[PDB]
Structure 1
Amino acid sequence: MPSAFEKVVKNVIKEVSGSRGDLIPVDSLRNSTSFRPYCLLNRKFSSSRFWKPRYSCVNLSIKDILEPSAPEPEPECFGSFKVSASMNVCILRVTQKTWETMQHERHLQQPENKILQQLRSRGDDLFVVTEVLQTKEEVQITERKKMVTIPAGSILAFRVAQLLIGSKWDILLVSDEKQRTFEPEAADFQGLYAEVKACSSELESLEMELRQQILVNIGKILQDQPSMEALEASLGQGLCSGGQVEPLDGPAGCILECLVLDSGELVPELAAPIFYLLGALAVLSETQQQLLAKALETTVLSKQLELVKHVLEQSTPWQEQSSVSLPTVLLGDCWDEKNPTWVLLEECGLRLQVESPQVHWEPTSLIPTSALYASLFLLSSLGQKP
């Protein structure tokens, strides 16, 4: 859904930074306080180069992992904008000189922080907020009647920099997608298909009874995000450490039981593709997850996958905004707002239309549409007959 705050945040990013902007939108006003400059964010191990997991809050600042312990310098105000009925926003940034000074004056906390040890075990990546886009004044944005007030100084969007911590700490201002925080090539549709097909090949191999229970239990964990979140951490820690994993409760536990041995250690060939599939589902929105949990039959899933496959295949180059025409004749019912394939595509940030062209590609929509494609491909690959 437009979520009111979610809709105003996307339009503000587009006006301030431009279409291919490197600004990440803030999910909610409650969480805004944790995305301030210098805040630390974690991300689960990146299983794919086409989709990335959402950033989570560590509720710690860069000073909390460095020595000597001291407050960070005040972020500089780069600029102000009148985004339009006029909302005033401003950019607070941590300069490169501030990072270089901090790297010279501060070193990693030598007896090692406990939170970093937890992230290292799960194979998570660590990031630091380098820039924020926040409101200057209080605005009363109105939405049914639901006036959402946004107070002054609210983080609407943010820029991150991956930090690499080992013997010394380093900040990646110019991002490198191949880098990992803790140390243990054309991006086209063809490479994306090969990556998902490699993961799908590992599935199918499993017995039809095993594939069906993993499939039905995925539909149950799609109802409970924290259940899926906990299962992901158990798999990530088991893959990065190789130790016995603690049994879980609910459908998360049932899926974990399928992927694990009599000793407690995960089977890497079974756990890795499931970790990829759960990571692709984590990228999707609540609405998208509840739709996939209903349409888990391989009949509708195959048609939805073919529509997403066509959208992605026709949107190359993925860096330009392009219009795509869809073969809606594939679907059993008419192409409208109530269609499940319309809702799955609209939740990816794609602007849809009733007819020719039906989809409007946005470069920003690559991360969720790759996750939706990989999710549909693997979920149909589980429910298929041998």
Structure 2
Amino acid sequence: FQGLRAEVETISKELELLDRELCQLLLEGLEGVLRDQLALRALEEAPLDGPAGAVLECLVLSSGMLVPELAIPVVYLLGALTMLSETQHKLLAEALESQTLLGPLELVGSLLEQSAPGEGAPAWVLLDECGLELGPHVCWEPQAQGRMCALYASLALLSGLS
């Protein structure tokens, strides 16, 4: 967990250096990329417009060249988001629009620390999409570790822009 949190902070610290207006335009573009997976599949091949087009305008210069100091953090965020389902993606943007990322990030970090190896609750939804047995319930199944670690990165990186 400590090595995972350090791997997250090495990118979260470098995304705090992005501008306030650029963080809002990046957040607006990613919330738009949510609704349309047509933008998600084009990252591996990668001017354009739209949700990913707005994100593209955030990470290019006057000549359109990529900024590796800013493209790599976005590549790492998309790499942690691909391990999650579209239901988890849409619930993450629900937490984005509600601007209450402190609660779920705190709970995921507290769980992730303990695990060294209910119905109608988004966290439970979130945990049901992860693959846990819901009903305290400290019982942890390792089959969902990677998605929860990717969820933690999908949470902390957004808090770095909050």
Task: Give the shorter-chain TM-score range.
Answer: over 0.9
Following superposition, the deviation at residue 288 of structure 1 comes to 0.4
Name the structure 1 match of 2:23: 211
Following superposition, the deviation at residue 283 of structure 1 comes to 1.1
1:266 is paired with a residue whose SS is coil
Q: Does the 8 Å CA contact 1:342/1:352 hold for their aligned counterparts?
A: yes
2:100 is paired with a residue whose SS is helix
Cα distance change, pair 232–293 in 1 and its aligned pair in 2 (3 A): farther
Name the structure 2 match of 1:339: 121
Q: Distance in 1 between matches of 2:45 and 2:141?
A: 31
Q: Distance in 2 between matches of 1:233 and 1:366?
A: 29
Question: Aligned to 2:115, which of 298, 315, 331?
Answer: 315
Map Cα deviations across residues 9-60 of structure 1 (whole Å, 9 max, x no partner).
Answer: xxxxxxxxxxxxxxxxxxxxxxxxxxxxxxxxxxxxxxxxxxxxxxxxxxxx
Name the structure 2 match of 1:325: none
Map Cα deviations across residues 292-317 of structure 1 (whole Å, 9 max, x no partner).
Answer: 1111057421110111111111110x
- The structure 1 segments of at least 4 consecutive aligned residues displaced by more than 4 Å after TM superposition are none
Alignment partner of 1:221 is 2:3: no
Question: Aligned to 1:274, which of 74, 77, 82?
Answer: 74
Following superposition, the deviation at residue 232 of structure 1 comes to 4.5
Alignment of 1:132-143 (within 5 A): none
Alignment partner of 1:198 is 2:10: yes
Matched AA of 2:14? E
Alignment of 1:246-257 (within 5 A): 247-257=47-57
Following superposition, the deviation at residue 256 of structure 1 comes to 1.1
Name the structure 2 match of 1:371: 150
Matched AA of 1:217? G
Matched AA of 2:74? I
Following superposition, the deviation at residue 380 of structure 1 comes to 1.7
Q: Distance in 1 between matches of 2:67 and 2:3?
A: 26
Any gaps of 5 or more consecutive residues in structure 1? Answer: 1-188, 235-246, 319-335
Q: Does the 8 Å CA contact 1:231/1:256 hold for their aligned counterparts?
A: no
Following superposition, the deviation at residue 372 of structure 1 comes to 0.5
Alignment of 1:1-386 (within 5 A): 189-234=1-46, 247-297=47-97, 299-316=99-116, 318=117, 336-353=118-135, 356-357=136-137, 359-382=138-161, 384=162
Q: Does the 8 Å CA contact 1:350/1:362 hold for their aligned counterparts?
A: yes
Q: Distance in 2 between matches of 1:337 and 1:365?
A: 19
Map Cα deviations across residues 98-129 of structure 1 (whole Å, 9 max, x no partner).
Answer: xxxxxxxxxxxxxxxxxxxxxxxxxxxxxxxx
* Count of matched residue pairs: 162
Taking structure 1 as the reference length, the TM-score comes to: 0.40
Q: Does the 8 Å CA contact 1:298/1:380 hold for their aligned counterparts?
A: no
Return the structure number with greater relative CO, CA threshold 8 A, min gap 6.
Answer: 2
Q: Does the 8 Å CA contact 1:220/1:293 hold for their aligned counterparts?
A: no
Cα distance change, pair 345–233 in 1 and its aligned pair in 2 (3 A): farther
Taking structure 2 as the reference length, the TM-score comes to: 0.93
Cα distance change, pair 233–192 in 1 and its aligned pair in 2 (3 A): farther
Q: Does the 8 Å CA contact 1:231/1:252 hold for their aligned counterparts?
A: no
Matched AA of 2:106? E
Any gaps of 5 or more consecutive residues in structure 2? Answer: none
1:352 is paired with a residue whose SS is coil
Q: Does the 8 Å CA contact 1:210/1:258 hold for their aligned counterparts?
A: yes
Q: Distance in 1 between matches of 2:22 and 2:63?
A: 19
2:18 is paired with a residue whose SS is coil
The structure carrying a bigger helix percent of its residues is 2
CA RMSD of superposed structures (Å): 1.5
Matched AA of 1:201? K
Instruction: Provide the identity percentage.
Output: 59
Larger radius of gyration: 1
Q: Distance in 1 between matches of 2:143 and 2:58?
A: 36
